[PDB]
Design a protein around this motif. Sequence first.
Motif, PDB file in Angstrom:
ATOM      1  N   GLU A  21       0.819  -1.204   0.000  1.00 27.33           N
ATOM      2  CA  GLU A  21       0.000   0.000   0.000  1.00 27.33           C
ATOM      3  C   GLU A  21       0.858   1.261   0.000  1.00 27.33           C
ATOM      4  OE1 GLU A  21      -2.629  -0.545  -0.975  1.00 27.33           O
ATOM      5  OE2 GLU A  21      -3.180  -2.557  -0.291  1.00 27.33           O
ATOM      6  N   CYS A  22       1.763   1.342  -0.965  1.00 29.95           N
ATOM      7  CA  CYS A  22       2.621   2.508  -1.108  1.00 29.95           C
ATOM      8  C   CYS A  22       1.869   3.541  -1.925  1.00 29.95           C
ATOM      9  CB  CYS A  22       3.943   2.152  -1.799  1.00 29.95           C
ATOM     10  SG  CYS A  22       5.162   1.330  -0.721  1.00 29.95           S
ATOM     11  N   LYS A  23       1.942   4.793  -1.510  1.00 36.45           N
ATOM     12  CA  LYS A  23       1.214   5.850  -2.190  1.00 36.45           C
ATOM     13  C   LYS A  23       2.031   6.440  -3.333  1.00 36.45           C
ATOM     14  CE  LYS A  23      -1.570   5.089   1.215  1.00 36.45           C
ATOM     15  NZ  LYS A  23      -0.616   4.202   1.940  1.00 36.45           N
ATOM     16  N   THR A  24       1.492   6.338  -4.533  1.00 33.06           N
ATOM     17  CA  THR A  24       2.133   6.867  -5.725  1.00 33.06           C
ATOM     18  C   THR A  24       1.054   7.246  -6.730  1.00 33.06           C
ATOM     19  OG1 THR A  24       3.970   5.295  -5.367  1.00 33.06           O
ATOM     20  CG2 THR A  24       3.916   6.473  -7.475  1.00 33.06           C
ATOM     21  N   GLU A  25       1.124   8.452  -7.272  1.00 32.97           N
ATOM     22  CA  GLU A  25       0.121   8.887  -8.228  1.00 32.97           C
ATOM     23  C   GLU A  25       0.216   8.054  -9.501  1.00 32.97           C
ATOM     24  OE1 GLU A  25       0.240  12.797  -9.772  1.00 32.97           O
ATOM     25  OE2 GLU A  25       1.765  12.285 -11.257  1.00 32.97           O
ATOM     26  N   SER A  26      -0.923   7.818 -10.123  1.00 33.84           N
ATOM     27  CA  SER A  26      -0.980   7.020 -11.326  1.00 33.84           C
ATOM     28  C   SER A  26      -0.365   7.751 -12.508  1.00 33.84           C
ATOM     29  CB  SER A  26      -2.426   6.652 -11.650  1.00 33.84           C
ATOM     30  OG  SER A  26      -2.498   5.782 -12.767  1.00 33.84           O
ATOM     31  N   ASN A  27       0.730   7.203 -13.006  1.00 37.59           N
ATOM     32  CA  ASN A  27       1.408   7.755 -14.164  1.00 37.59           C
ATOM     33  C   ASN A  27       0.582   7.450 -15.404  1.00 37.59           C
ATOM     34  OD1 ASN A  27       2.444   5.071 -13.193  1.00 37.59           O
ATOM     35  ND2 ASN A  27       3.292   4.988 -15.262  1.00 37.59           N
ATOM     36  N   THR A  28      -0.195   6.378 -15.307  1.00 43.09           N
ATOM     37  CA  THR A  28      -1.060   5.932 -16.383  1.00 43.09           C
ATOM     38  C   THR A  28      -2.241   6.886 -16.568  1.00 43.09           C
ATOM     39  OG1 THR A  28      -0.603   3.772 -15.374  1.00 43.09           O
ATOM     40  CG2 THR A  28      -1.962   3.793 -17.365  1.00 43.09           C
ATOM     41  N   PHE A  29      -2.728   7.442 -15.456  1.00 43.75           N
ATOM     42  CA  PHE A  29      -3.861   8.366 -15.470  1.00 43.75           C
ATOM     43  C   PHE A  29      -3.505   9.630 -16.260  1.00 43.75           C
ATOM     44  CE2 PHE A  29      -7.355  10.685 -13.151  1.00 43.75           C
ATOM     45  CZ  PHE A  29      -8.356   9.789 -13.471  1.00 43.75           C
ATOM     46  N   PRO A  30      -4.113   9.804 -17.445  1.00 42.18           N
ATOM     47  CA  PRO A  30      -3.847  10.942 -18.318  1.00 42.18           C
ATOM     48  C   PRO A  30      -4.723  12.161 -18.037  1.00 42.18           C
ATOM     49  CG  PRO A  30      -5.233   9.361 -19.471  1.00 42.18           C
ATOM     50  CD  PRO A  30      -5.096   8.881 -18.045  1.00 42.18           C
ATOM     51  N   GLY A  31      -4.826  12.561 -16.779  1.00 42.60           N
ATOM     52  CA  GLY A  31      -5.629  13.722 -16.467  1.00 42.60           C
ATOM     53  C   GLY A  31      -5.812  13.961 -14.984  1.00 42.60           C
ATOM     54  N   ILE A  32      -6.847  14.723 -14.663  1.00 46.48           N
ATOM     55  CA  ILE A  32      -7.182  15.064 -13.291  1.00 46.48           C
ATOM     56  C   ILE A  32      -8.095  13.997 -12.692  1.00 46.48           C
ATOM     57  CG2 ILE A  32      -8.138  16.859 -11.787  1.00 46.48           C
ATOM     58  CD1 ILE A  32      -7.728  18.853 -14.035  1.00 46.48           C
ATOM     59  N   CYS A  33      -7.952  13.742 -11.396  1.00 44.79           N
ATOM     60  CA  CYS A  33      -8.774  12.751 -10.715  1.00 44.79           C
ATOM     61  C   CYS A  33     -10.207  13.258 -10.600  1.00 44.79           C
ATOM     62  CB  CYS A  33      -8.203  12.449  -9.327  1.00 44.79           C
ATOM     63  SG  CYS A  33      -8.889  10.958  -8.530  1.00 44.79           S
ATOM     64  N   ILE A  34     -11.008  12.947 -11.603  1.00 43.99           N
ATOM     65  CA  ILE A  34     -12.392  13.382 -11.636  1.00 43.99           C
ATOM     66  C   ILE A  34     -13.280  12.368 -10.927  1.00 43.99           C
ATOM     67  CG2 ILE A  34     -14.337  14.044 -13.116  1.00 43.99           C
ATOM     68  CD1 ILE A  34     -11.970  15.976 -13.178  1.00 43.99           C
ATOM     69  N   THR A  35     -12.968  11.091 -11.111  1.00 47.59           N
ATOM     70  CA  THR A  35     -13.725  10.017 -10.493  1.00 47.59           C
ATOM     71  C   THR A  35     -12.815   8.846 -10.125  1.00 47.59           C
ATOM     72  OG1 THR A  35     -14.454   9.641 -12.792  1.00 47.59           O
ATOM     73  CG2 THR A  35     -16.141  10.310 -11.192  1.00 47.59           C
ATOM     74  N   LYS A  36     -13.239   8.063  -9.133  1.00 47.55           N
ATOM     75  CA  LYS A  36     -12.466   6.908  -8.675  1.00 47.55           C
ATOM     76  C   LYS A  36     -12.448   5.777  -9.722  1.00 47.55           C
ATOM     77  CE  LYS A  36     -11.334   3.045  -6.277  1.00 47.55           C
ATOM     78  NZ  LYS A  36     -10.856   3.288  -4.884  1.00 47.55           N
ATOM     79  N   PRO A  37     -13.602   5.422 -10.352  1.00 53.70           N
ATOM     80  CA  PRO A  37     -13.662   4.340 -11.358  1.00 53.70           C
ATOM     81  C   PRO A  37     -12.506   4.361 -12.386  1.00 53.70           C
ATOM     82  CG  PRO A  37     -15.863   5.197 -10.998  1.00 53.70           C
ATOM     83  CD  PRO A  37     -14.942   6.008 -10.121  1.00 53.70           C
ATOM     84  N   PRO A  38     -12.228   5.499 -13.077  1.00 51.86           N
ATOM     85  CA  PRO A  38     -11.131   5.569 -14.053  1.00 51.86           C
ATOM     86  C   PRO A  38      -9.771   5.395 -13.379  1.00 51.86           C
ATOM     87  CG  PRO A  38     -12.617   7.443 -14.289  1.00 51.86           C
ATOM     88  CD  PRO A  38     -12.930   6.789 -12.976  1.00 51.86           C
TER      89      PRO A  38
END
Length: 47
Positions: free
Chosen positions: A2-19
Motif C-alpha cells: 500500500e505505497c502511495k504513488t500517483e498514477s502515471n497511467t492516469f492521463p488527467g485530473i482525478c475526476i472520479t475513482k472508477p477511471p
Amino acid sequence: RECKTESNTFPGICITKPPCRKACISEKFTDGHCSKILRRCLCTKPC
C-alpha cells in the motif's frame, strides 16, 4: 504494501475513482483514489 504513488497511467485530473481504479490495476498497484492534497489519482501498490 500500500505505497502511495500517483498514477502515471492516469492521463488527467482525478475526476472520479472508477477511471483511477483501473489505472492503478494496469500499473503495479491495487487501489487508487484522489489524493487529499490536490486532485491526482493516488494509487496504492502492494510494495
